[PDB]
Subunit: 261 residues, 4 copies
């Protein structure tokens, strides 16, 4: 297994894409630390699901908007499993609103979680990676980091900024065994997206989720199909593998053709 | 002249690129409101420089990191000159540091001024532009919004984010007479850049500003010459003119070839 | 009174109609002398010349097939003899052919590559030595949004326009320390006979021959502004790139597309 | 037992360098592979045996990718020997370094023909069967030079940019199917086409990693694009460049 022995931390990995990434990393042999904002009654089941692949799996609740809790997550991983070798910055939120009425607090929260938390986690993990001469920082961006979409100003700004950050980290580590790269998914059927589909279904299609899902998807995604959490996880495993030793500062876009048009 | 009668606000226009933009907009016929962080002894001389072109000029001190002062700047313009028709989001700061030691407060400040302030000013100006059926929002990004550079993680993240924000605003206004675009300068010999070059000269070139300047340009800018504040202003005039009525959500890169390679 | 491009000699390939004519008009309005060009001599040439010349500059016409390097050279030499050294070169002659990849005709693929990409290389190669000798030049390549993104059934055109943008970058880098710049303009949909024919095909296929609905559907698929870009706007972009404020704009794209590439 | 087991791959221009590395990695992942070069050569048995060390079916076919009839012959040979072409890797590419002013016209034409138009012909010939079978991979070997420019490489940058544009269109025209089309963009790789202090000098200007990309890494990117996890990777670039395009 290509990642056997490596210690990975996936932020926001209690559901959706984050859980899919953690699952795929474990299948590839990595020990994994799962993380959610607050402790959930589903945490034990999630940890056992990931542990089914025979690696060491832990859970640590931490609000990634709080730098002290980011540090606590890293220290917990170092105590339980060892030095963080793979860092996946995934935790992120969405808020759909036109620019004129976009709430200031929601803008600030999206910037804080989708961009600044990745900076804090990366800052905390890089010293050990440099000392060991190996590391992977994998930032879960979006197609919205490469193009714009209406009513997603804060999210598009934060994801564009996360891609910029990725480039700089990669350039500062380019002569080391540390790489930094971003994965840019298109639409994946998570709760983050199911809520948006609900909103459009109520507003436009009489609550019909089949019709609304197709209209939502086909607006943006030429494949007329969702990307899966399994595919995003496969991209993360690829970036963490030796074949990606010279992939630095780039985007792996998994989007059904969204950015190609 | 092409912008005769239009009222423009340029944030951070007491120095460098912002002042060059204000001067080129005034040369093109616009009335202009200047802005700096705080009142300075040189303010009246800067007003005189911009007023040399025969238009109406005002000055308002306001900290763009404070949303209430942004609002005060807009209301001042409305009282003195009229509705804000051209908004140039320019005020910006830089801090050079590797990611591992990048100070948290400096990261936050760069995000706040170079990205979030533009969101606040745009939000405050859009309703009047929509009511009147015309507007220009011109965001001063950077080459660092399109590619990364070592030791500039916060600034690259902020400038990338500002370009993403530009796309979204443009898309939300695409069917109106309002456009939103970004200008992406390469190196311009302003105090923001002079300070970086002086730091490099003292740290690595024995105080030789000629050698430090050569090395600074040669690293990144194929033209081996600076872009000028007048050229950035000329790009702003172009975006504000009628020939740009259908230029929306794009970047005008004025960089001596930086991004082409 | 003198104008911003007064004294400069421009050549615009494929400038007897549409975008090329709009560019020629705007350059002449900005004070440039202009050589117009079409594939072959036509009865309309005189009227087009006089229309451009109404702005008080020197205007000429030369018929040349831009697929034939000998005729490209003849166009440049004609300009040198009639008006003087070519200082602004606008590579605009291009063609379109809509087809799925599986059935795309080989000859049409070759023709689109030849006109939309290789002709610009030939003209640029022929004009650069004089520009370098004089220390000043503008090469302005008329690309497309299709040089930055793909669209279905336009494989050859998207390939050629992407290639033209790559070529633009290299020319700009090889001239970056000189007074010569090279850049590309990337229009979205402009109401020209090329787009008109595409819309006619769409109308006869999907909307039963309704031109209003066909036009609206054609625009809204790709162009968020739900309005066409105009030939005048493309010309304004060319004038901007040719002007002194663009002395340090090198190897880049000016995208005039109603938001097409922003989403 | 392997992710590409049973898949039939054709790699154009695969007798050495990057193309051979791709063939080796595809076979390592279980693919049957047809190798290709311009002319029949000694060492062709050697390269076939090298790739066949991975335990799959390996063939060789000589064909000049500038000749549409020979491209068709390559595809038909593959269909006869192994079955339908399922993975097509377009890697017939050549280079010529020259300033624009003196760039030979025939060299410009040849670079466009091999680096761009040959990929169109091969893709056109392979797509109908892929559509019928419900699955395909078209993997175009582009370059960093398809995303940025470099001095003295006008024809190559134009052709590689064009190949990326072509990739987007093919992907969009197949987006609702089991066929994907994508491009791999390598930075400097230590091949004859490219080639201690001299090495660092050549790498320093463009490649921040100050090290070469390997042929095995380019092959690993092709295996990734051919795998099920890439079913919804469409019309994009996988850039393997040591940071070149990030700055
Ligand atoms: N779903 C999609 O279509 C796409 C999503 N993405 C990104 O993928 C990442 C995962 O999103 P999804 O799985 O769709 O959403 P989700 O709602 O299914 O998952 C959110 C996860 O983040 C955790 N989380 C939220 N706020 C947190 C905080 N402050 N601290 C710690 N953990 C926190 C939640 O507990 C949950 O584990 C997000 O960054 C999203 O922006 C990117 C592109 C496409
Ligand atoms: N100089 C360069 O090479 C490049 C600069 N830029 C951008 O151009 C913009 C202008 O920068 P420069 O002219 O080079 O710098 P500068 O230091 O000469 O000018 C900065 C202006 O911003 C004002 N400012 C700073 N903080 C402020 C605050 N909190 N509130 C209000 N005003 C404030 C300063 O008073 C000054 O007027 C910045 O956004 C910079 O990112 C972009 C690319 C290249
Ligand atoms: N019309 C549009 O929506 C867009 C067009 N463009 C590009 O703008 C340029 C002009 O296109 P349009 O004005 O729209 O089309 P058009 O058909 O109106 O213009 C074609 C012009 O090129 C000339 N021409 C054609 N083949 C020639 C040849 N072999 N030798 C010499 N001259 C030749 C024709 O005489 C005519 O003057 C083309 O490069 C097109 O690719 C770019 C983006 C959008
Ligand atoms: N070498 C590098 O640094 C980079 C190379 N590439 C691309 O990778 C591809 C392979 O290049 P390299 O391995 O570096 O070069 P190479 O010279 O080692 O490989 C050339 C291969 O193509 C074959 N070939 C050449 N012309 C042919 C034709 N007309 N028909 C059939 N086969 C033909 C040759 O027999 C040889 O097998 C080329 O497209 C190159 O542009 C991409 C980016 C970086």
């Amino acid at each position: 297994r290509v990642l056997s022995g490596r210690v990975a931390v996936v932020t926001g990995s209690t559901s959706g894409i984050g859980l899919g990434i953690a699952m795929r990393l474990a299948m590839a042999g990595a020990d994994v630390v799962l993380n959610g904002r607050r402790q959930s009654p589903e945490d034990s089941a999630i940890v056992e699901k990931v542990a089914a692949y025979g690696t060491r799996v832990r859970y640590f609740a931490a609000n990634m908007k709080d730098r002290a809790q980011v540090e606590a997550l890293i220290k917990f991983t170092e105590k339980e499993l060892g030095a963080v070798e793979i860092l996946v910055n995934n935790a992120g939120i969405q808020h759909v609103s036109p620019v004129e009425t976009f709430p200031s607090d929601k803008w600030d929260e999206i910037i804080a979680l989708n961009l600044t938390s990745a900076f804090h986690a990366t800052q905390l993990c890089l010293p050990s990676m440099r000392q060991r001469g190996w590391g992977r920082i994998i930032n879960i961006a979006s197609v919205q980091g490469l193009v714009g979409s209406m009513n997603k100003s804060a999210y598009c700004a934060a994801k564009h900024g996360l891609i910029g950050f990725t480039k700089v980290v990669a350039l500062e580590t380019a002569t080391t065994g540390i790489t930094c790269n971003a994965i840019c998914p298109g639409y994946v059927y998570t709760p983050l997206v199911e809520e948006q589909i609900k909103a459009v279904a109520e507003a436009k299609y009489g609550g019909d989720m089949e019709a609304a899902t197709q209209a939502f998807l086909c607006e943006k995604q030429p494949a007329k199909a969702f990307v899966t959490v399994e595919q995003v996880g496969d991209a993360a495993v690829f970036l963490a593998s030796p074949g990606a030793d010279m992939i630095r500062g780039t985007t792996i876009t998994v989007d059904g053709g969204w950015v190609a048009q």
